[PDB]
């Protein structure tokens, strides 16, 4: 998952509207270039490399018509559907999710609502209450960020692979002036952008900025 800056909208979208046409009728290649421009060759939220190009609508097409064809909601995802986490699980395995409850990663920062433990789990951010706290669990349940044993085993296996990295970096703190150490941490957080589960490795090498 990474921030994206959307750019010039494809004209083909202006040619297709809900009721007049369906998503299937659109030429995917007519929209693929623009996508490649904003997210490069990396998946938007669920963060594969795009060896398997996949176009997704963040909001489901079924419940949310009209906005299906609009440029804003077209992103990348884990891969071509032709599983139990990331995108698919919301409509199949989840229950009666109420839309706005869930956290949408393109206006609100996920860190303000949930953090990543070194055990590979994800829990609501400390100090959350009320509806702010409600958004935290419900993003875990609907996206099944924990219940999917494949996800828990990959997030955990990723952080645990670099936990000694956090040990050696931090233990050298006193031996080097602050300006030099912060540079080491800067390179450390630079590479996790190009690795799976960046937020999981972000909260293991620093905090969520509570």
């Amino acid at each position: 998952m990474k921030e994206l800056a959307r750019l010039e909208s494809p004209e083909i979208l202006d040619q297709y509207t809900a009721g007049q046409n369906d998503w299937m009728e659109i030429d995917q290649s007519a929209v693929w270039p623009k996508l490649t421009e904003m997210q490069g060759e990396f998946c938007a939220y669920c963060e594969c490399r795009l060896n398997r190009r996949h176009i997704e609508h963040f909001r489901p097409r079924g419940k949310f018509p009209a906005l299906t064809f609009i440029w804003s909601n077209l992103f990348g995802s884990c891969g071509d559907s032709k599983w139990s986490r990331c995108g698919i699980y919301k409509d199949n395995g989840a229950g009666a999710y109420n839309a706005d409850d869930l956290i949408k990663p393109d206006e609100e920062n996920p860190d303000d609502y949930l953090l990543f433990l070194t055990t590979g789990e994800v829990v609501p951010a400390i100090g959350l209450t009320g509806r702010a706290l409600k958004k935290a669990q419900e993003t875990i349940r609907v996206f099944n960020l924990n219940g999917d044993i494949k996800l828990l085993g990959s997030r955990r296996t990723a952080v645990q692979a670099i936990m000694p990295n956090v040990e050696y970096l931090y233990s050298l703190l006193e031996e080097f002036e602050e300006d030099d150490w912060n540079e080491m941490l800067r390179d450390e957080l630079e590479k996790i952008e190009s690795d799976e589960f960046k937020t999981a490795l972000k909260h293991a090498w620093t905090s969520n900025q509570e």
Partner: protein, 429 residues
């Protein structure tokens, strides 16, 4: 008296075996809750459970019939072939409440042609069993539920001899349970419908302990009464269930039926006392079921002792290290004790338990690729923690074989990064 202080634990404490089936002298302590024996595939552990079953058979014989002479040892098999003693003793101590904290027993057998008739000393166990029988006859009292379950329970699948109390002890020991008797008894209960609550208890028992099964009933079709379950949402008969599913259902249902007849006065007849031996609790089970067998067993039978053998790390990962009893790989040098594992097992990694408790590496050594990652480590440390042609080739091999997200590749990347930072800081320092 409160039914003679019976209605106080009731369990086994110790088992000594002297010149009995390769056991020159072996004393085993047993936990009131759950003991698990490991190390052998079930040769010496079968001997241990067989000796415990022989001991329990006397309790059964005397609770059933007055003066009943339970199973005796055999002059032909249950005596170490090479023993200057020329007799075999199977001694065992029991603990039954605050009063009678030590009920001893010995089953002795001497070869033919020995001067003294080395004789079993079963008087105190017989006395306790006679107390059970007499106080039960005077007033109904819940009684122990002894059972045995060996690898023979993996077997394909009369109102007088199935519905009358004390039928719970029939073939209770000796191995495979009487699941056919349970089937007939359950059909009879369904025909009758106290029987209602018994039916409900058995239903909840095998619905909760068995993951796949979610319901059980019988269709009373005219001319053929069938027992049906809901396996994975499919309404099937018992003949349709898989080997592991039906084998475990038979084990749990036989046990539950025995406890329901033996414990009529409990609010939950599954919480009655007993000593259940189970060879290879993991039989026909998959890792996911292994990781919950003992939790479910202990949940549905709150107050009962389990002596169960096993060879699965997932099973041990759910049991405290105190409960485990390790046979040494060099048992040929007969040992007098079974020490618990040094490492804690409950709540631990299955991989760690497998590596240390059982001496089984996390990755097989027969596969060359299995060693690759480890080799890489050494190679990195050979070239001053820096890449060379060999380590680069090994990294490429790991990346190609295991994949790009491969845990092995991630750990290789971490190793190279750590070593490069080592060298960089060494230069800086």
């Amino acid at each position: 008296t409160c039914r003679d202080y019976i209605q106080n634990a009731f369990y086994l404490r110790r088992l000594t075996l002297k010149d009995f089936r390769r056991f020159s002298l072996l004393e085993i302590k047993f936990e009131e809750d759950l003991t698990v024996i490991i190390g052998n595939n079930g040769k010496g552990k079968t001997s241990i459970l067989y000796a415990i079953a022989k001991t329990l058979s006397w309790f059964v014989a005397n609770i059933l019939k007055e003066g009943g002479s339970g199973q005796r040892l055999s002059e032909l098999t249950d005596i170490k072939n090479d023993a200057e003693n020329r007799y075999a003793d199977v001694s065992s101590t029991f603990f039954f409440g605050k009063g009678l904290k030590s009920v001893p027993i010995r089953l002795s057998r001497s070869a033919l042609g020995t001067a003294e008739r080395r004789d079993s000393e079963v008087k105190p166990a017989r006395d306790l069993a006679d107390i059970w029988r007499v106080i039960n006859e005077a007033k109904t009292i819940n009684l122990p539920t002894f059972a045995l379950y060996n690898v023979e329970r993996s077997q394909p699948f009369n109102a007088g001899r199935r519905e009358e109390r004390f039928d719970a002890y029939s073939q209770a020991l000796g191995g495979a349970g009487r699941f056919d008797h349970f089937v007939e008894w359950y059909i009879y209960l369904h025909k009758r419908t106290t029987e209602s609550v018994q039916k409900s208890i058995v239903e909840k028992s095998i619905c909760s302990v068995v993951p796949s099964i979610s319901k059980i009933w019988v269709e009373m079709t005219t001319g053929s009464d069938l027992v049906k379950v809901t396996n994975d949402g499919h309404d099937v008969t018992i003949d349709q269930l898989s080997d592991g599913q039906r084998v475990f259902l038979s084990l749990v249902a036989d046990l539950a039926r025995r406890m329901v007849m033996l414990n009529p006065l409990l609010e939950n007849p599954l919480e009655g006392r007993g000593i259940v031996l189970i060879d290879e609790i993991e039989l026909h089970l998959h890792p996911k079921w292994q990781q919950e067998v003992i939790l479910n067993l202990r949940s549905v039978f709150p107050n009962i002792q389990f002596i169960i053998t096993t060879h699965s790390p997932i099973v041990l990962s759910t049991i405290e290290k105190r409960c485990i009893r390790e046979f040494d790989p060099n048992d040929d040098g007969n040992q007098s004790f079974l020490d618990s594992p040094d490492m804690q097992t409950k709540g631990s990694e299955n991989a760690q338990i497998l590596e240390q408790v059982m001496n089984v590496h996390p990755t097989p050594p027969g596969i060359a690729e299995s060693h690759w990652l480890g080799d890489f480590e050494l190679l990195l440390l050979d070239n001053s923690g820096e890449l060379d042609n060999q380590s680069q080739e090994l990294y490429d091999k790991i990346k190609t074989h295991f994949g790009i997200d491969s845990a092995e590749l991630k750990k290789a990347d971490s190793l190279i990064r750590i070593n490069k930072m080592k060298n960089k800081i060494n230069k800086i320092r």
